[PDB]
Point group: D2
Chain length 262, copies 4
């Protein structure tokens, strides 16, 4: 049906995009980047993340496909050599759709609210000075965190920043989010859990300022300075990202290919 | 209905057990340690684990309750001072039952099979020499693990051995198991994922010997030498342990009380 | 001889400072904050670090003493209740001087040089985007580091930021520096050593930009944005900080009191 | 002068050994495996460790050389293709000798003493049940360790078991030993330092039993069950292993070749 193609913007990806558009012109496929049903991302995971956020208002009407022109991007299913096969299989449809969970971040201020959706993770750090927040889980005070910051990851995000922080890798069929620490301070007077925490759907993790109320909050690639923050709330989103699958590429094989050998 | 009480066996726990039996004698409660419906464990988590394995054939007919006579045992909900309140609330029933997931371990041999159920975890180490196994996830070869051993944990087990190995803490409403490494070797020629792995229901993790076929396999407290092993299979059990709850004691508050402060 | 006293600046520390000056007025002690021989720091480790950097040009003519008015500051040897004993013992001198190693950081630019001395550590992060540096040890290319940043610690600094990053704790009689990673990326294409690295005197660790040349460099509490950086060089300083000791307080007991129990 | 050659024992190493003996027969070199001055090890690091322990009584009269017939063994300096060059350079002598520190382990019993020398590390675990020891540093009680065990490493050993336990890598010019934890238990009631600890020469680390007095103690490859143990003492040895060097192969380049790329 309606489709669009985003490109990393180097010569290789731009030309691949033009060739796929040319191939799509031989089928009942309309190029439409306002209301597409298929969104093809040609580049790396950064490119794929930008495509996700470009259309995060129509996630229920869109199936995503990634082509990796560099190395194996984690959200990519195809090499550039298979683009013609992809054009052909996509045009005839009848594919499988799989869905990964997403993370909802709510930022509340004094004398307002903003919500963000993350495919990989949302992190919080301070605006320069020391980072201290109270961690509140389903309204019970769990810990006072002192350190560099905190990272809340989706399942598919667990192989990204979460992994570098010592977090566990979670299969994306698990509707959950995972909280990892960035360089926590632990001594006689300061104490955190240390371990990563995995939360199910409907659990709410709230960060509440102790002194400083300015924070640098990242959502996937995007990092914003937020001022006069009263609370940051994390929960598994009700929204999901949908992928168009045309063949078996299991998550654990994807992990193996990216970290063990390929 | 029918109940029984296990004791750690020190004077404190034995006397508490006798007093609870005396109190139960004032209600329509029959002591029966062959087919109980309530199993009370008075002691620590070691005592509770022994009670679980004492009745792992009737897990669907039993609700467990733990009283901690030492520190806060993780599976314990009551201090000894509340035993009389527990006797009274139990006798009148109408309580809530909550269920935690369990781990199934299957051990196959050459020229046979044995299955085990774990509330905390199942671990594998070698019989002395080097430990090398191929890790196979849903029939795809994921990695060749070299090191001290491997640990597969239930959700409620994530706060136990799993935590000491760097694993994530998982809420027990998540039907999953978590695989953590014990001192993996990683250099130019040997490579493991490093990170803990969290698997959903119906995923099968199989360990297959490379050279030596003798392994020391632990299931909760119980450790056995297994010889001529062809495979060790891990999967989330279809069976669940049921707890009798009489008041709110959230898992994350339980974690806070055990590791942060109480 | 000549002495001065720095205060954290709260009422408790200011009054303690005034009382010690009054007590010192009964001995042959001159208050001189231009060329002191004893520098007393009343506050926490932040206060002590500021005193160190206030006089880092006269480190060979100064013995430092710390009084902790909050909790046990790691560089502190005295509680406020012993200030009168300290005044008396200091006035009569004949004490022991012990010396801890320091870290030298050299920052080179295009179309210039700046050097800094650290008592705790020096860290490097990027100016916002991705952090990528080549790590060069004694002129051999060791690794290309991708991640959040890097931390180079002194021995006495190993209990500070270094500890939160998984670094080892080193006794300060060892003339060394320790390099720890902040959230390194490790996959099929990107590879770091992972482990902390401990370097002896005369080894030089050089960080060289790969793309972006702007970095945020911290030295103890002080963090500066450096632009147009060609190289960051780390080596154990030839300079040392000298402490006035009046009684045994072993480093490992200091570690025990701060992290295990007191 | 006098030399001997140990072989891994496969065909490749045995034949290389015979060829080197044949080449040595053309110089003033005598084969003597009772009082050699050069000890050549042909195999892996396991082979080299056995050669070290074969002659640990004459460490001051011996310079070691390793040839790796498998991958790059860490104590190996030569590939088999350079054996003829090695024979020639060795025969004419005038080489450089470098020395690495060693670890002394003393095991005391009730109603006796045994000492062991380690090139890599010495570890302690329990005889099956729980492992609990009091850690005493220079006669001050530092911590009560509960967990799987403890590992004390030499500098050159830091790239071996120590690395897999999260320990730091230390340059061998530093006369030190490093203590790392194996799966320590840390909760409200049990507390260890967590971090690796690096000790200088003359510091003594003593492990003292709390309940069970039987331990499995490993020294490099060799693991023995020790019964009725009163104390295990660790200190940097006064003895050193000497290597014959014929060219520059820096330790950090050795680390790079083994863990980053070669
Ligand atoms: C940074 C940056 C600039 C690029 C934008 N990227 C895109 C991505 C991605 C992504 N999602 C996943 C995933 N789902 N599974 C597995 N792998 C994944 N990746 C891969 O990780 C790398 C990300 N970029 C870099 O490391 C920058 C290179 C420095 N020369 C690339 O190789 C991706 O192919 C944003 C993502 O960055 C992640 N990120 C940030 N800081 C770190 C860090 N310290 N360690 C590890 N990841 C980190 C974070 O989660 C964010 O969303
Ligand atoms: C060992 C042993 C002998 C005692 C038998 N225990 C009973 C239990 C338990 C248990 N389940 C949980 C849980 N669900 N949540 C949170 N906490 C939990 N615990 C608590 O952990 C301790 C277990 N025992 C010891 O550490 C022995 C003491 C040494 N002086 C106790 O404090 C328990 O109150 C068996 C369990 O041992 C665990 N275990 C074994 N080795 C380690 C290790 N190295 N680190 C951490 N745990 C370890 C493992 O998972 C096993 O099932
Ligand atoms: C930050 C900050 C503001 C305060 C300035 N401080 C002073 C100090 C110190 C210091 N030197 C040592 C030492 N030698 N031994 C053992 N302990 C030590 N400390 C103690 O660590 C804490 C430092 N400050 C904080 O954590 C801020 C509180 C947040 N509400 C205090 O308790 C000190 O009593 C500067 C030092 O910060 C260290 N620092 C920074 N970020 C982290 C982090 N993520 N984790 C751990 N330490 C960190 C770093 O190395 C720097 O030099
Ligand atoms: C085990 C075993 C049987 C072999 C005997 N080896 C010889 C050696 C060595 C050695 N010294 C160093 C060093 N100095 N620098 C860097 N690398 C080094 N190595 C290398 O590490 C490996 C050791 N063997 C194995 O891993 C067995 C293979 C399993 N299929 C080999 O690749 C060596 O080329 C004894 C040494 O084992 C080390 N060891 C034991 N358990 C672990 C573990 N869990 N993780 C990491 N190392 C471990 C320990 O320190 C001991 O001394």
């Amino acid at each position: 049906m309606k489709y669009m193609i985003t490109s990393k913007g180097d010569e290789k990806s731009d030309l691949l995009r033009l060739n796929m558009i040319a191939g799509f012109g031989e089928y009942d496929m309309e190029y439409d980047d306002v209301e597409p049903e298929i969104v093809i991302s040609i580049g790396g995971d950064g490119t794929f993340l930008s495509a996700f956020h470009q259309y995060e208002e129509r996630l229920d009407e869109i199936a995503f496909i990634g082509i990796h022109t560099g190395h194996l991007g984690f959200y990519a299913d195809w090499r550039p050599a298979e683009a013609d096969k992809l054009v052909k299989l996509l045009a005839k449809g009848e594919y499988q759709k799989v869905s990964y969970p997403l993370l909802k971040t709510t930022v509340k201020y004094g004398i307002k609210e903003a919500t963000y959706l993350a495919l990989n993770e949302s992190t919080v750090k301070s605006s320069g000075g020391p980072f201290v927040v109270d961690v509140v889980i389903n309204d019970i005070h769990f810990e006072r965190f002192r350190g560099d910051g905190l990272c809340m990851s989706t399942p598919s995000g667990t192989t990204a920043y979460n992994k570098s922080l010592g977090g566990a890798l979670m299969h994306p069929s698990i509707e959950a989010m995972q909280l990892t620490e960035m360089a926590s301070i632990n001594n006689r007077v300061y104490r955190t859990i240390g371990s990563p925490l995995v939360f199910p759907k409907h659990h709410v993790v709230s960060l509440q300022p102790v002194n400083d109320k300015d924070f640098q909050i990242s959502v996937d690639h995007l990092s914003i300075l937020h001022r006069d923050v009263q609370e940051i709330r994390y929960e598994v989103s009700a929204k999901k990202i949908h992928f168009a699958r045309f063949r078996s590429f299991p998550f654990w094989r994807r992990v193996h290919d990216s970290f063990i050998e390929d």
